[PDB]
């Protein structure tokens, strides 16, 4: 199926995002596109590039 992806299923959910730089984000996913993921981390809004993510725990 063209464009199928598991990351969409994380919308709305609270997850831990492990970045390639060692950072870990305690985040709530507010949006997912092909190449990006939108999250709230505390007071912060972040646009995270999927290419920068190693894995996500959910």
């Amino acid at each position: 199926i063209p464009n199928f992806e598991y990351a969409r299923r994380l919308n709305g959910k609270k997850v831990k995002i492990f970045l390639r730089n060692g950072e870990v984000l305690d985040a709530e996913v507010t949006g997912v596109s092909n190449y990006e993921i939108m999250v709230k981390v505390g007071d912060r809004n972040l646009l995270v590039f999927k290419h920068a993510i190693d894995y996500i725990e959910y």
Copy 2:
């Protein structure tokens, strides 16, 4: 054509060697074009293929 070996890993116990040195002793629960779902102990993980060097199966 547009074939990929990673799909055959669905259902299998593998060791995943990440680009940062970590190794996951995991069971593959799903595979898409860019991601691999695994259970590691009690932990549910979505792992991006770009962060994987190689997989031992």
Copy 3:
């Protein structure tokens, strides 16, 4: 498809966290498929998206 969240940043003051540890306090002046144009102080930079970890906005 033809959607990206980065286009929403055009014209905004943001913090760009590069993959090299640098953090650019930037004004976004353009967004293309693979690049973001920013003014950092007096400098004009063309920043490749692949070099960006995330952006605070």
Copy 4:
């Protein structure tokens, strides 16, 4: 879809990974993004993106 990597199928090669490791390997399969190898007793799926170069 032309690629040289396909021609390595069946060959003994040295795979230089992006972290510094090297693999003495027998190529058993090649897809668009992956190379399947046997390294001694081990079966590996190697992503091309993690490889720097290959000596054949």
Copy 5:
């Protein structure tokens, strides 16, 4: 095929590579994935994926 990098085709720019190296360069060519530069007396094909950003 909209990209800003094409607009640099004749300009002197500073290219900041992913490994920390900096190039004082005059752009001579730009393709989808490459930028051709003269740095001093050297002729370089620089891959865009190796570039973090460019000051122009």
Copy 6:
């Protein structure tokens, strides 16, 4: 359009500067979308473009 300067390097002696810090004193024997084939001394290398930073030619 599908244009890439690397095709011109076919046949030439060049210095390849890899993302890892290595330099290859190489003769280009073939070029595809994703790969460059080189002879470095008596050695035959398949070099992935993604692992190349730049090339002096």
